[PDB]
Amino acid sequence: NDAAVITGSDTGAVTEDESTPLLTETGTLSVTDVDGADEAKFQAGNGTPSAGALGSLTITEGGAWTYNVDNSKVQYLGEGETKVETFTVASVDGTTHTVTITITGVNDAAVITGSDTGAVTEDESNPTLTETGTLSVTDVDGADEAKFLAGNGTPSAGALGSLTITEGGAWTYNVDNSKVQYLGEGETKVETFTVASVDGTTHTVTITITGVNDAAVISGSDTGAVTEDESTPLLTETGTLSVTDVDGADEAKFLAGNGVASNGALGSLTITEGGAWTYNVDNSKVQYLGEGETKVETFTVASVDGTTHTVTITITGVNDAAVISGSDTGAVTEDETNPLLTETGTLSVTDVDGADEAKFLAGNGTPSAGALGSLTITEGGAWTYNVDNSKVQYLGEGETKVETFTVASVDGTTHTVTITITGVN
Ligand SMILES: [Ca+2]
Ligand SMILES: [Ca+2]
Ligand SMILES: [Ca+2]
Ligand SMILES: [Ca+2]
Ligand SMILES: [Ca+2]
Ligand SMILES: [Ca+2]
Ligand SMILES: [Ca+2]
Ligand SMILES: [Ca+2]
Ligand SMILES: [Ca+2]
Ligand SMILES: [Ca+2]
Ligand SMILES: [Ca+2]
Ligand SMILES: [Ca+2]
Ligand SMILES: [Ca+2]
Ligand SMILES: [Cl-]
Ligand code: NA
Numbered sequence: 225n226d227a228a229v230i231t232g233s234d235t236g237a238v239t240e241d242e243s244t245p246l247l248t249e250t251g252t253l254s255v256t257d258v259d260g261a262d263e264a265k266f267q268a269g270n271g272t273p274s275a276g277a278l279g280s281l282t283i284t285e286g287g288a289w290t291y292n293v294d295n296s297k298v299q300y301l302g303e304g305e306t307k308v309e310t311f312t313v314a315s316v317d318g319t320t321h322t323v324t325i326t327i328t329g330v331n332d333a334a335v336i337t338g339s340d341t342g343a344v345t346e347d348e349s350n351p352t353l354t355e356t357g358t359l360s361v362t363d364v365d366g367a368d369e370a371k372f373l374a375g376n377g378t379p380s381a382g383a384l385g386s387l388t389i390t391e392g393g394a395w396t397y398n399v400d401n402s403k404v405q406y407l408g409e410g411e412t413k414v415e416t417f418t419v420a421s422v423d424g425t426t427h428t429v430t431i432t433i434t435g436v437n438d439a440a441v442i443s444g445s446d447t448g449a450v451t452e453d454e455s456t457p458l459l460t461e462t463g464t465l466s467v468t469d470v471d472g473a474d475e476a477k478f479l480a481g482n483g484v485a486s487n488g489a490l491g492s493l494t495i496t497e498g499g500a501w502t503y504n505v506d507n508s509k510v511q512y513l514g515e516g517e518t519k520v521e522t523f524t525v526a527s528v529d530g531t532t533h534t535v536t537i538t539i540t541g542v543n544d545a546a547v548i549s550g551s552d553t554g555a556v557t558e559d560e561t562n563p564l565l566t567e568t569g570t571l572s573v574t575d576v577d578g579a580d581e582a583k584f585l586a587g588n589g590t591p592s593a594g595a596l597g598s599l600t601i602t603e604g605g606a607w608t609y610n611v612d613n614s615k616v617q618y619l620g621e622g623e624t625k626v627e628t629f630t631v632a633s634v635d636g637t638t639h640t641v642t643i644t645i646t647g648v649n
Contacts, residue, residue, distance in 0.1 A: 228257040228264065228319035236291055238279075239328045240298045247279075247295055249325060253287035255315055263317045271311030271323060281311035281323055289313065291325045301329020302365035303423075334363040334370070334421035340429050342397060344385075346404045346436045353385075353401055355431060359393035361421045369422040377417025377429060387417035387429055395419065397431045407435025408471035409529070440469040440476065440527035446535050448503055450491075452542045456507045459491070461537055465499035467527050475528045483523025483535060493523035493535055501525065503537050513541025514577035515635070544576035546637035554609055554641065556597075558616045558648045565597075565613055567643060571605035573633045581635045589629025589641060599629035599641055607631065609643050619647020 233251030240247070257263035271281035271289065279293030291311070301307060307327040314320050339357030346353075363369035377387040377395070385399030397417070407413060413433045418426050445463030452459070469475035483493035483501070491505030503523070513519060519539040524532050551569030558565075575581035589599035589607065597611030609629070619625060625645040630638050 225317065226258040228255045228315040228317055230255050230313075230315065230319060230321035232287065234321060234323050236323065236325045237328065238291070238293065238298075238325065240301055240330045241295060244295050247293050247298065247327070249291040251289055251323065253283070253289065253313065253321060253323075255287060255319075257315065257317060257319075259317065263315060265316045267314050267316060271313045274308075274310040277309040277311070278307070279309055279325060279327070281313075281325070283313045289323055291323070293327065298327050298329065299332060299364045300366060301327065302369065303329060303331040305329040305365075329365070331423055332364040334361045334423055334425035336361050336419075336421065336425065336427035338393060339395075340427060341432075342429065343432045343434065344397070344399060344404075345434045346407055347401060350401045353399045353404065353433070355397040357395055357429070359389065359395065359419065359427060359429075361393060361425075363421060363423060363425075365423065371422050373420045373422060377419045380414075380416040383415040383417075384413070384433070385415055385431065387419075387431070389419045395429055397429070399433065404433050404435065405438060405470045406472065407433065408475065409435060409437040411435040411471075435471070437529050438470040440467045440529060440531035442467050442525075442527060442531065442533035444499065446533060447538075448535065449538045449540065450503070450505065450510075451540045452510045452513055453507060458504045459507055459510070459539070461503040463501050463535065465495070465501065465525065465533060465535075467499060467531075469527065469529060469531075471529065477528055479526045479528060483525045486520075486522040489521040489523070490519070490539075491521055491537065493525075493537070495525045501535055503535070505539065510539050510541065511544060511576050512578065513539065514581065515541060515543040517541035517577075541577070543635050546573045546575040546581060546633035546635055548573050548633060548637060548639035550605060552639060552641050553644070555644045555646065556609070556611060556616075557646045558619055559613060562613045565611045565616065565645070567609040569607055569641065571601070571607065571631070571639060571641075573605060573637075575633065575635060575637075577635065581633065583634050585632045585634060589631045592626075592628040595627040595629075596625070596645070597627055597643060599631070599643070601631045607641055609641070611643075611645065616645050616647065619645065621647060621649045623647040 232253040236249035238247035283289040338359040342355035344353035384403040389395040444466040448461035450459035490509040550572040554567035556565035596615040601607040
């Protein structure tokens with residue numbers, strides 16, 4: 225027996241996903257046999273596969289071979305990855321030939337799932353705000369590709385924080401708490417970070433930062449003073465508060481209107497958006513305060529976000545002169561008694577500065593120049609004048625001598641008692 229000569233197309237190629245559901249390749253082999261044309265033909269049927277062939281090859285008597293493989297079975301091949309399969313065909317005689325099929329893989333996108341959102345709040349921790357989560361990845365091109373590229377996610381424009389992921393998919397977002405202070409209550413900033421699997425398939429993690437209120441910082445003039453009777457009918461005090469607010473210029477101003485007064489305040493205070501305050505009180509309401517006596521009134525004002533500050537006003541009293549009345553005159557007549565001529569009367573005092581000032585300094589009245597007599601007064605206002613009858617004898621019938629005595633209330637207010645001495649023969 226002489227071996228057939230088998231020639232023609234004995235190689236073929238299919239690419240993953242070139243067609244569906246089958247990848248198919250064809251070729252024709254030709255056979256000549258020197259033992260005659262009954263031998264110069266192929267055994268029709270399946271070629272004998274290499275071990276671990278996924279595809280199959282059939283050949284006709286005429287040498288027309290077809291390779292078929294399920295596209296589903298070659299998905300695991302990565303971009304450019306080759307699998308070579310061989311099939312043995314034979315002459316009617318038994319002379320063998322091999323057909324060589326190459327399968328070439330294409331990339332399959334990774335499938336990325338799991339936690340791809342997170343949230344941090346201003347001041348939840350310090351100095352760093354942290355969020356964590358886990359992505360997971362599958363990739364039909366194999367365990368080699370079913371992994372993240374470890375490192376930083378590519379940040380959105382103007383992101384404050386950063387995100388790192390591990391090969392297993394564990395991500396960590398961190399932002400400096402100092403950098404998010406400027407966000408107001410419930411205000412949000414969204415930052416995104418793009419991560420990648422080995423084959424360059426991307427997924428986004430979206431992080432929402434939420435702000436909390438920062439208390440305004442109020443400073444400037446928060447104290448003021450008025451003095452009774454410095455002006456009328458109002459006593460007025462002004463000052464300017466300043467405010468900053470890290471939550472922004474929207475918040476760095478005052479709520480215009482009245483300050484909330486301390487209970488028992490006699491005055492009132494208004495403030496402008498720009499922090500200019502004005503305290504007013506009716507002068508008539510503070511008369512009752514005595515010299516140097518104080519009354520402190522406080523007014524609560526607020527910034528836009530409700531941060532409060534106190535303005536403290538001190539009212540200082542001044543003396544009101546006592547009103548002195550009652551019996552401030554008296555009379556004695558030469559020889560009416562002996563050896564003293566005596567006269568009594570009672571003064572009264574009332575004082576706007578209070579019942580505490582409604583009394584006299586007890587003691588001697590300050591005598592007029594050349595006074596013969598003298599006068600004492602009690603704390604209650606009862607006075608007593610005495611003169612020696614011997615010293616008034618010189619006065620003629622109906623001739624008078626007027627003597628005056630200055631007394632004082634406890635606040636220093638003076639009053640005169642006037643005594644008339646009348647002469648006889
Ligand atoms: Ca032969
Ligand atoms: Ca593939
Ligand atoms: Ca892949
Ligand atoms: Ca594929
Ligand atoms: Ca969180
Ligand atoms: Ca804030
Ligand atoms: Ca803050
Ligand atoms: Ca604020
Ligand atoms: Ca007064
Ligand atoms: Ca007064
Ligand atoms: Ca007084
Ligand atoms: Ca008083
Ligand atoms: Ca006389
Ligand atoms: Cl597919
Ligand atoms: Na703001």
